[PDB]
Amino acid sequence: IVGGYTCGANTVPYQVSLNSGYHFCGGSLINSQWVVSAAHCYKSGIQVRLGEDNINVVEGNEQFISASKSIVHPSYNSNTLNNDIMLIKLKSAASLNSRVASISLPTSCASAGTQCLISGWGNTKSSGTSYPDVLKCLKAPILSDSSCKSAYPGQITSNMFCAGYLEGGKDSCQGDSGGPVVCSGKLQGIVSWGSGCAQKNKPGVYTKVCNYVSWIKQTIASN
Ligand SMILES: NC(=[NH2+])c1ccc(CNC(=O)[C@@H]2CCCN2C(=O)[C@H](N)Cc2ccccc2)cc1
Numbered sequence: 139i140v141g142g143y144t145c146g147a148n149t150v151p152y153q154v155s156l157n158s159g160y161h162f163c164g165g166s167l168i169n170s171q172w173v174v175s176a177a178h179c180y181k182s183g184i185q186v187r188l189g190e191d192n193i194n195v196v197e198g199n200e201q202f203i204s205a206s207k208s209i210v211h212p213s214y215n216s217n218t219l220n221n222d223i224m225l226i227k228l229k230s231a232a233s234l235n236s237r238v239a240s241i242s243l244p245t246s247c248a249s250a251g252t253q254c255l256i257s258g259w260g261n262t263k264s265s266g267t268s269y270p271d272v273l274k275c276l277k278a279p280i281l282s283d284s285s286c287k288s289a290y291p292g293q294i295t296s297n298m299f300c301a302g303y304l305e306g307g308k309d310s311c312q313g314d315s316g317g318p319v320v321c322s323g324k325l326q327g328i329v330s331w332g333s334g335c336a337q338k339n340k341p342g343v344y345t346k347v348c349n350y351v352s353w354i355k356q357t358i359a360s361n
């Protein structure tokens with residue numbers, strides 16, 4: 139997260155870190171057994187880390203749970219990141235508490251102009267690299283689809299939306315991949331892609347979760 143702020147420990151209790159020896163992606167807890175992340179975060183051997191603030195220090199509220207299965211969206215395209223969503227099942231149910239909590243799936247999509255909270259442990263620099271160890275947060279509005287497509291002509295599908303600031307300076311970044319965009323209490327986006335980070339006229343692009351709620355609900359009920 140570039141241009142954001144330190145969230146505060148466990149103030150985003152649905153935020154998970156995906157760990158394969160190191161943090162490599164974010165995700166969102168949607169019930170005690172399931173996490174939503176980005177398909178571009180797919181790999182084997184995932185440990186889900188819940189209750190995290192500083193990902194390099196055991197602070198006392200963590201739950202570390204291995205994934206038992208991962209399900210990449212059936213239509214994910216790795217060349218374009220269309221359908222950039224994946225479900226991860228926990229081998230044992232998380233113990234839900236005020237620091238480890240699920241985020242509600244959208245009943246309805248959100249409209250342009252709605253403010254959202256984006257969070258993660260990704261790079262905080264718009265040029266170069268600095269990775270924080272505590273969770274960072276950013277308030278950012280959904281941008282119009284026309285400004286999104288103007289920024290990225292020929293690349294935006296109906297399964298994507300842009301959010302952030304066309305002037306630059308505030309954005310998500312590498313390492314935030316797969317983490318949440320929460321608007322009005324619903325998981326509306328997943329950190330997906332963009333050109334650089336926090337660059338002028340290059341806003342963040344996010345998987346449009348509301349298009350996937352039927353698939354999520356049917357997939358978790360059958361797995
Ligand atoms: N909001 C942002 N500026 C931002 C940008 C990037 C990321 C992390 N996501 C990435 O790094 C993804 C993974 C594959 C390549 N990639 C990218 O974002 C590429 N830079 C652009 C690209 C390549 C192929 C298809 C779609 C988009 C997270 C946030």
Ligand SMILES: [Ca+2]
Binds near residue numbers: 195
């Ligand atoms: Ca920790």
